[PDB]
Design a protein around this ligand. Structure first.
Ligand code: BCL
Ligand code: BCL
Ligand SMILES: *[C@H]1O[C@H](CO)[C@@H](O[C@@H]2O[C@@H](C)[C@H](O)[C@@H](O)[C@H]2O)[C@H](O)[C@@H]1O[C@H]1O[C@H](C(=O)O)[C@@H](O[C@H]2O[C@H](CO)[C@@H](O)[C@H](O)[C@H]2NC(C)=O)[C@H](OC(C)=O)[C@H]1OC(C)=O
Ligand SMILES: CC(C)=CCC/C(C)=C/CC/C(C)=C/CC/C(C)=C/CC/C(C)=C/CC/C(C)=C/CC/C(C)=C/CC/C(C)=C/CC1=C(C)C(=O)c2ccccc2C1=O
Ligand SMILES: CCCCCCCC/C=C\CCCCCCCC(=O)O[C@H](COC(=O)CCCCCCCCCCCCCCC)COP(=O)(O)OC[C@@H](O)CO
Ligand SMILES: [Fe+3]
Lengths: 153, 176
């Protein structure tokens, strides 16, 4: 997992990886919110969600109003499970696309990030002379040596 | 005017103020879903989901738990409100849904949702009484009734739970 990110030039700049994280975090946000919400009305039967969906009680109403008063909008007892479903599903769906794009369409995600303007500028930590630019070019990694050389001479 | 509440003032987004007793009228945290269907909830095979335990001999107390029947119920004002006569159980997901309380110093028996009871020492030891922190022993007399004693409707569930829910705001208030 680490070497894959190293090989393809830092997976943080893969936008589908970034999305997959947004849904992964959102799944923890939603289940924290929803778990806490249903336990906060469980003494009024809020955990009997199928009844609250088919025959709305005060436990469903209080759950809707808490979030409406908190953040200005709310789900229903049924539709919060759709938000839950999609956030979980979109975690692995966007993840899969990001992997399929990697090494097929983009080989260096940080440079793709530079191209599309994702990369914040920092002051240069070092500057190379033209002579160093040729000296410090490496070589791509090849095969291991298949012999044990003697240096007897 | 029967209207349960009036605006605190004419500005947008002002609170409402209850006219009568908010616990009885059902205002604020004492309110219930008034349009809720007035029918019993049903199991998959169509029997009544919530019934007194004496009506289904399948159910029994787990061995080494206390049976709460016959214990006194201690209300928010430390008065003895009554004693547990019966348990009501959920037959779809086996648990105790309500205690039924024979009222002390009164004729009537009332339901008490177990979410509002707690054991002394949270059940670990003692277990010689029940605590109802949310309402006074006087207010136990006004807990809503079920139309029958063998079944409870979804509306009656909402009404009863809403009564104990409101207590934490209105039990110790002159707003009655
Ligand atoms: C948690 C461990 C790390 C960290 C690691 C990562 C990694 C790794 C990634 C992110 C990603 C994101 N992180 Mg971060 N992040 C941290 C701390 C934070 C904090 C904070 C503590 O205040 C915030 C607000 C953010 C915010 C964000 C978003 C820009 C983005 C999507 C999050 C998301 O959907 O989450 C779940 C929450 C929701 C679904 C609710 C909606 C949240 C919205 C989107 C937050 C917007 C904030 C906005 C930019 C700033 C508001 C203030 C302005 C001044 C008005 N990070 C710490 C340091 N974060 C991803 C990304 O897209 O990066 C480019 C990503 O790949
Ligand atoms: C240095 C390391 C790299 C990095 C490299 C990678 C790579 C590489 C990948 C991810 C992927 C993911 N990374 Mg990243 N990641 C880094 C930093 C982060 C940070 C962070 C705070 O810094 C966060 C929050 C994340 C978060 C995430 C997730 C959003 C995403 C995985 C989704 C998922 O549900 O996978 C978990 C879910 C699964 C794996 C699905 C499994 C389902 C199957 C069917 C289960 C079968 C079980 C079977 C029956 C039994 C098994 C038996 C045994 C074989 C014996 N990464 C850095 C940049 N990350 C993945 C992705 O989608 O990338 C776009 C991915 O491939
Ligand atoms: C043993 O042999 C292997 C395989 O050649 C050498 O590994 C090479 O060099 C590494 C940089 C690389 O990782 C690896 O892929 C492979 O390219 C390993 O270093 C040992 O080298 C000595 O033996 C070499 C050999 O192959 O026999 C020999 O190579 C030279 O001689 C042979 C035989 O005449 C010829 O086939 C080669 O083409 C020739 N190569 C070169 C570059 O001259 C090495 O001699 C020299 C001078 O490289 C040996 O190295 C030493 C110091 O003895
Ligand atoms: C800053 C500014 C412009 C000020 C102007 C002046 C104003 C507006 C003053 C008024 C006073 C105040 C304090 C206003 C607040 C203004 C602010 C800061 C608003 C921002 C609100 C906010 C945090 C928005 C973020 C929204 C996001 C992205 C949330 C992430 C989670 C998410 C995806 C939720 C969607 C799903 C929902 C709706 C979940 C809630 C929800 C859950 C969790 C249930 O379990 C449940 C169970 C049964 C029925 C309903 C529900 C239900 O609705
Ligand atoms: C200060 C608040 C900021 C809120 C937003 C915070 C961010 C949301 C979090 C995570 C998203 C992570 C995945 C996205 C990765 C983002 C990086 C990315 O790929 O960007 C471009 C594509 O997207 C784009 O243009 C389009 C970006 C769309 C972003 C939509 C985010 C969700 C909705 C947000 C609603 C806010 C409402 C605020 C109300 C108060 C690149 O391609 P393109 O070369 O073509 O462009 C270049 C041009 O954007 C200049 O660089
Ligand atoms: Fe749920």
């Amino acid at each position: 997992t680490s070497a894959f990110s190293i090989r393809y030039g830092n997976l943080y700049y893969n936008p589908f990886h970034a999305l997959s994280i947004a849904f992964l975090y959102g799944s923890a946000v939603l289940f924290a919110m929803h778990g806490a919400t249903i336990l906060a009305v469980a003494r009024m039967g809020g955990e009997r969600e199928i009844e609250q969906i088919t025959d709305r009680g005060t436990a469903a109403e209080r759950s809707m109003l808490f979030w409406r008063w908190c953040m200005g909008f709310n789900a229903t007892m049924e539709s919060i499970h759709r938000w839950a479903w999609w956030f979980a599903v979109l975690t692995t769906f966007t993840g899969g696309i990001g992997i399929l794009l990697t090494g097929t369409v983009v080989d260096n995600w940080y440079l793709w990030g530079v191209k599309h303007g994702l990369v914040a500028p920092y002051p240069a930590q070092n500057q190379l002379t033209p002579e160093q630019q040729d000296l410090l070019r490496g070589r791509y990694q090849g095969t291991a040596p298949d012999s044990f050389p003697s240096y007897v001479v | 005017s029967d209207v349960k509440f009036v605006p605190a003032d004419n500005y947008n987004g002002s609170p409402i103020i209850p006219t009568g007793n908010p616990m009885i009228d059902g205002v604020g945290p004492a309110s219930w879903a008034e349009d809720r269907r007035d029918e019993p909830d049903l199991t998959y095979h169509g029997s009544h989901k919530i019934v007194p335990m004496r009506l289904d001999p399948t159910f029994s107390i787990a061995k080494g738990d206390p049976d709460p029947r016959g214990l006194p119920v201690i209300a928010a004002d430390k008065q003895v409100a009554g004693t547990v006569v019966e348990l009501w159980v959920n037959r779809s997901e086996p648990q105790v849904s309500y205690y039924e309380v024979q009222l002390a110093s009164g004729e009537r028996r009332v339901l008490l949702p177990t979410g509002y009871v707690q054991w002394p020492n949270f059940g670990l030891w003692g277990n010689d009484k029940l605590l109802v922190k949310s309402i006074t022993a006087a207010q136990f007399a006004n807990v809503p009734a079920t139309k029958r004693d063998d079944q409870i409707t979804l509306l009656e569930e909402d009404k009863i739970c809403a009564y104990y829910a409101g207590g934490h705001m209105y039990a110790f208030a002159e707003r009655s």
